[PDB]
RNA sequence: CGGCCAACUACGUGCCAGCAGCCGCGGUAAUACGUAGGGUCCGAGCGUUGUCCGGAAUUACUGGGCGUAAAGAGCUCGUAGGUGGUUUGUCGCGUUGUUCGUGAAAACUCACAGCUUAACUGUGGGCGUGCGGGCGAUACGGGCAGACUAGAGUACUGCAGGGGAGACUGGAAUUCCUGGUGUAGCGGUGGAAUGCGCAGAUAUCAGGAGGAACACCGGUGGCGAAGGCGGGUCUCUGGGCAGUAACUGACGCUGAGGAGCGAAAGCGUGGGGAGCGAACAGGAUUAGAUACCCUGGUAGUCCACGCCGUAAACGGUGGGUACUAGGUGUGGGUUUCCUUCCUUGGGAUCCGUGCCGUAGCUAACGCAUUAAGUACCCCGCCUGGGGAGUACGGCCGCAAGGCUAAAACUCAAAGGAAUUGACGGGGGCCCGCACAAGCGGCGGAGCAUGUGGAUUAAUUCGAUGCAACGCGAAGAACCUUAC
RNA sequence: AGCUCGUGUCGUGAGAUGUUGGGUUAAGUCCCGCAACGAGCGCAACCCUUGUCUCAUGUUGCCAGCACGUUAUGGUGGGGACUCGUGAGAGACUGCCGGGGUCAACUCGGAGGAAGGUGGGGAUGACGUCAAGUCAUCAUGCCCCUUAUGUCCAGGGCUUCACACAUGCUACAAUGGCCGGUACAAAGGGCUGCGAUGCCGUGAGGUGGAGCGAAUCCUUUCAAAGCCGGUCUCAGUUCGGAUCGGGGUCUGCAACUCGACCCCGUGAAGUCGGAGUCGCUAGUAAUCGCAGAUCAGCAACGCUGCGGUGAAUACGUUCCCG
């Protein structure tokens, strides 16, 4: 949903606030809403949901990428800038209109088709499983 | 000006009195004698910083507290400083009057002490740039407190010209009348001239 | 012994006395002045001064640029010179192909050796980077001795165009004149008055006269080498573009000096002269206007013949050639195919002209096949700012003037792009008794205190717009009280 | 209401982003997309007072309902049923609805409610600027006097005055001056101080002195404007009070410069005001009183606060200042 700028390049200043998000679950979890005044309560609920909304993946990832995949990369320069400036390898679909030297392993396809799109999201989602089994 | 006092701000809700008496009649003298033995202190005892001062008294009985980082020089182990200021109580004629000393849990918590600490480093011979780094660390080591700043006024280094320097860290919350702000300063001696310091302690919020 | 630049403190005078190679150092508390110590460098020498090279790639052949900092001449034609599109043939004059043959001595560089080592010199080499003739080569780099054509030109058919010159001609508008009608104003600016009217203005109708220029089409469009070029019509003519490729078969390019064209203004002669409009009069504003404003209007603006030859003459970028990703419009011409074969239909091709963008270049803005990209050929221009595009001299011009183009002295900077504030009589969106609608006030007079200014032996001192003034003084016979 | 920082990214470098643009808010308040992600000083909130109700709660304070007063009134025996005062708690949070809104912030209208969209006012001054003011609050480096520029009183002047500016008071007169009658406040001070009742003074005040370290006693039962009655018929005036002289009180060793207050005569000046200029959008403006305070008197119309009577308008940013 929401790319934050450098959040891969600059890990250390969301690490923290991947910890205040646990902190903020295990808080809530724990039943203490009528504690604090209402005014602060809904101000709470409304960065959980702003929060929650717009970071989904560096709640499972912790331990920083190996590899990065990217869709609809002429819109989305700003990863496979990050990706290139860290060195981290490149995999991502590149249209009619993409730079090919920025992906390290282009995938030729379209991004603006929802058929082809899902199509090679699950190919590459079942080569992940495979090697997951194959681990 | 730019700024009142913060012990004055909020003296009404987060923080307390020293000195708690009733006095309608003499109440003249009873602070002129207050203010008096507390210059003598000041002056006669420059070697143990003396946090807080703190008098109560009824009818004619009245105790002084006195908070020091340490007491080993505040009251020898025989009691002859102690002997010396009660000397100088009954010279000023303060009747009946007992002493207490107490040692503070954090000396780099408090404002006075650090403030009296950063006064002697940059007198003798320290920089202030190291003197506040030192001050700074030694007071984030702590955990409770969380927001730092410290101001200097006066000739840095011996110029001939005023600099009006400081250095922040964490969150002090000056208009936030909850906030539980430490206030403190000292004037430091110098063969140039004097300069003043200022610090202000973040110590938490009270719910109440 | 401030930073450049290895070496700091105290004492003495403070915009004085003084230092200094660049920045620059003293306006009572100087590591920069003078003296002390202390340390640094060097040393029988130590510094100052002058000349020469380097850094200075700051005269750039190796090894600079010309958009804005210094520079593309205004642009063409073109002489002398410099440079050439393929392959078909000798001599070897640009040239390397090896050898013998000179390179005086001395010096430099290598090794040896002697003065005890030192300068000094003792011996033998080597070095002695250029030039002479005899013998042996032919790939490039030239003339010479023969053929073809990918540059160029011509030839056949079409093409669009404000390209230029002369002549003829049209309408609208302004002004003026003549004759009606028609009444007291018309013109003017932020406001008014000089201006024309009651002798008949303005307005309006009819007619005529004369001069300039062509509104719409008319555009970031066409042409020209560049200045520039547009009412039609005729007359003559240049340049450019596409296809067939018939023919010429090294004719190509740029071009120092030289010569021709050239915006406006200016000059001579002789005509023209409606409108516009330097100069000059008045009226107006301002303390002041010899300007901005108003009313008038003489050169000029028009024509013919000559002249001067300068513009921010800009794309601030010379021309020519070859190569290097695209997208979006316009103009001109050839073709082919959905095919109605109507259609900016679709496709191919060349030329011209706008916009945005890669890689790349640039200090940046920015350019980006119509390069500032990567190169080749030639030509002009620049070496810190003033002096100065000026004096003298030379050339042209009848003159105004134009071209060629210095030196002394002075400054230690002047300049190009870009970042951020501040300001704005630049703009948009917002705030408040800021205005608007308001009551009550002060500024006219008594009061009772405070402040400047003048007297006295003192009239203590401090605060002088916002943010001082019934302020410290929220209490003067002694005190306060400092004179 | 803006001011910054950490990581990151672009350029090479000053730097830039974050802090931009759209919507919204009193505000960097919030939301949308973006090489930004976030954090700090800010801003709002937390504090005091003020607007309501409930509980707790009756004396020196009030009196619903009972008795004694008999001219002096809760004055007296009695009582929390209310204010009175001070504790705890509740109550404004777009709480709910309709419409616009990107279905998001937010806005207008509507019901309840005391308040409606920070209810009102305060304390609360971010980085910095004016080398802003203060060596006469205090403290201080340097220089200067040390037999003086130190100390003490041989008294005086800080207040002198041909004139200007600055801020106030009282007015310029009838919405008034004066005279008589007459009802409502808050808060606060008092030990070498407040000072009752009483007597004498026109009145400053004098004798005397109860009650108080203070909801009690004194600051009068805290009043003034406010209401009724009478005069003035618009005059330099019954407005207006200075100036000067004549007589006393008060603090004090001692009132000439150089005090205040009380009494008399004193009768000048001036009729809403020149350009320009100030403050005020709800208890506000305007007007009338009281009190903290320094003090022994006093230049006390001042500063500060406590009160009383109490308006008008906002069509909107084109112009002036920020
Ligand atoms: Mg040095
Ligand atoms: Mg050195
Ligand atoms: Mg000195
Ligand atoms: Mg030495
Ligand atoms: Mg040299
Ligand atoms: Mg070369
Ligand atoms: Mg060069
Ligand atoms: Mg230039
Ligand atoms: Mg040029
Ligand atoms: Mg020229
Ligand atoms: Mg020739
Ligand atoms: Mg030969
Ligand atoms: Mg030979
Ligand atoms: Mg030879
Ligand atoms: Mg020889
Ligand atoms: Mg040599
Ligand atoms: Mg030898
Ligand atoms: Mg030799
Ligand atoms: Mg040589
Ligand atoms: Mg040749
Ligand atoms: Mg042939
Ligand atoms: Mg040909
Ligand atoms: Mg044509
Ligand atoms: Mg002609
Ligand atoms: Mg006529
Ligand atoms: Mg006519
Ligand atoms: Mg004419
Ligand atoms: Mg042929
Ligand atoms: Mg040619
Ligand atoms: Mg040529
Ligand atoms: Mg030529
Ligand atoms: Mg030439
Ligand atoms: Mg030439
Ligand atoms: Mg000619
Ligand atoms: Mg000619
Ligand atoms: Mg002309
Ligand atoms: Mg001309
Ligand atoms: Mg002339
Ligand atoms: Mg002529
Ligand atoms: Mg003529
Ligand atoms: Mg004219
Ligand atoms: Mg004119
Ligand atoms: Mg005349
Ligand atoms: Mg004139
Ligand atoms: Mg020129
Ligand atoms: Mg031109
Ligand atoms: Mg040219
Ligand atoms: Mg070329
Ligand atoms: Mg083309
Ligand atoms: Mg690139
Ligand atoms: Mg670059
Ligand atoms: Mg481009
Ligand atoms: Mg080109
Ligand atoms: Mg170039
Ligand atoms: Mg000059
Ligand atoms: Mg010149
Ligand atoms: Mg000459
Ligand atoms: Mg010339
Ligand atoms: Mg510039
Ligand atoms: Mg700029
Ligand atoms: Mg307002
Ligand atoms: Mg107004
Ligand atoms: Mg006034
Ligand atoms: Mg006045
Ligand atoms: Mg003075
Ligand atoms: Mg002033
Ligand atoms: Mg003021
Ligand atoms: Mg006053
Ligand atoms: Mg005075
Ligand atoms: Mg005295
Ligand atoms: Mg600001
Ligand atoms: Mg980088
Ligand atoms: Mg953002
Ligand atoms: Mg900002
Ligand atoms: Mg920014
Ligand atoms: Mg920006
Ligand atoms: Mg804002
Ligand atoms: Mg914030
Ligand atoms: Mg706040
Ligand atoms: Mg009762
Ligand atoms: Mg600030
Ligand atoms: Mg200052
Ligand atoms: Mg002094
Ligand atoms: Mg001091
Ligand atoms: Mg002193
Ligand atoms: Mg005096
Ligand atoms: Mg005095
Ligand atoms: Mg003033
Ligand atoms: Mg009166
Ligand atoms: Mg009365
Ligand atoms: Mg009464
Ligand atoms: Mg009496
Ligand atoms: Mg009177
Ligand atoms: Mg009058
Ligand atoms: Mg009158
Ligand atoms: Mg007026
Ligand atoms: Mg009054
Ligand atoms: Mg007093």
């Not at chain 1, 250390?12 to 602060?40: C, D, I, N, P, Y």
């Not at chain 2, 004698?33 to 009824?58: C, N, P, Q, W, Y």
């Amino acid at each position: 949903q929401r790319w934050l700028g450098g959040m891969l390049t600059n890990f250390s200043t969301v690490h923290k606030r991947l910890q205040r998000l646990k902190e903020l679950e295990a808080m809530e979890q724990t039943g203490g809403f009528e504690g604090r005044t209402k005014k602060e309560i809904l101000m709470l609920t409304r960065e959980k949901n702003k929060l929650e909304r717009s970071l989904g993946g560096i709640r499972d990832m912790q331990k920083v990428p190996s590899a990065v995949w990217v869709v609809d990369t002429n819109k989305e320069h700003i990863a496979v800038g990050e990706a290139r400036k860290l060195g981290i390898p490149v995999i991502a679909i590149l249209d009619t209109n993409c730079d090919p030297d920025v992906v390290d392993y282009p995938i030729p396809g379209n991004d603006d088709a929802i058929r082809s799109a899902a199509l090679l999201t699950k190919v590459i989602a079942s080569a992940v499983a495979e090697g997951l089994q194959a681990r | 000006g730019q700024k009142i006092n913060p012990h004055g701000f909020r003296l009404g809700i987060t923080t307390e009195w020293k000195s708690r008496w009733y006095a309608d009649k003499q109440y003249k003298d009873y602070v002129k004698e207050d203010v008096a033995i507390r210059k003598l202190l000041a002056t006669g005892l420059e070697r143990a910083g003396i946090a807080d001062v703190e008098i109560e008294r009824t009818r004619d009985r009245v105790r002084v507290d006195i908070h020091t980082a340490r007491p080993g020089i505040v009251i020898g182990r025989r009691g002859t400083e102690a002997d010396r200021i009660r000397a100088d109580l009954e010279k000023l004629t303060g009747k009946q009057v007992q002493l207490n000393i107490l040692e503070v849990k954090n000396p780099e918590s408090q404002a006075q002490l650090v403030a009296q600490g950063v006064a002697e480093q940059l007198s003798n011979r320290v920089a202030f740039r190291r003197a506040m780094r030192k001050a700074i660390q030694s007071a984030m080591r702590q955990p409770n407190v969380k927001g730092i700043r410290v101001q200097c006024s006066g000739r840095l280094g011996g110029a001939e010209m005023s600099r009006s320097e400081f250095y922040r860290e964490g969150r002090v919350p000056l208009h936030t009348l909850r906030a539980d702000i430490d206030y403190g300063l000292y004037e430091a001696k110098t063969t140039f001239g004097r300069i003043g310091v200022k610090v202000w302690i973040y110590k938490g919020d009270i719910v109440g």
